[PDB]
Homo-oligomer: A and B are copies of this chain.
């Protein structure tokens, strides 16, 4: 199924706008996603994912 994420403002960190055939096309957009670690222990880490 599709998922509709929500990216906080500080996470959106790069983008571009190139005029292609007289149109504004966003050629690039890079944002951050942040999660924990599934160590078998109960300790919590911080992992990073860049989409």
Measuring CB to CB, which residues of chain A are less than 8 angstroms from any residue of chain B?
3, 14, 16-19, 22-23, 27-28, 30, 35-36, 38, 42, 44
Given contacts A3-B23, A23-B3, contact A42 B17 (CB under 8 A): no
If A27-B38, A38-B27 touch, whether A44 touches B22 (CB-CB below 8 Å) is no
Asked if B22 and A36 sit within 8 Å, CB to CB, the answer is no
Q: How many copies does the complex hold?
A: 2
Asked whether A35 and B14 contact (CB < 8 A) given A28-B42, A30-B42, A42-B28, the answer is: no
The complex places the Cα of A42 from the Cα of B30 at a distance, in Å, of 10
List the B side residues contacting A44 at CB < 8 Å: 14, 16
A34, closest chain B residue (CB): B17
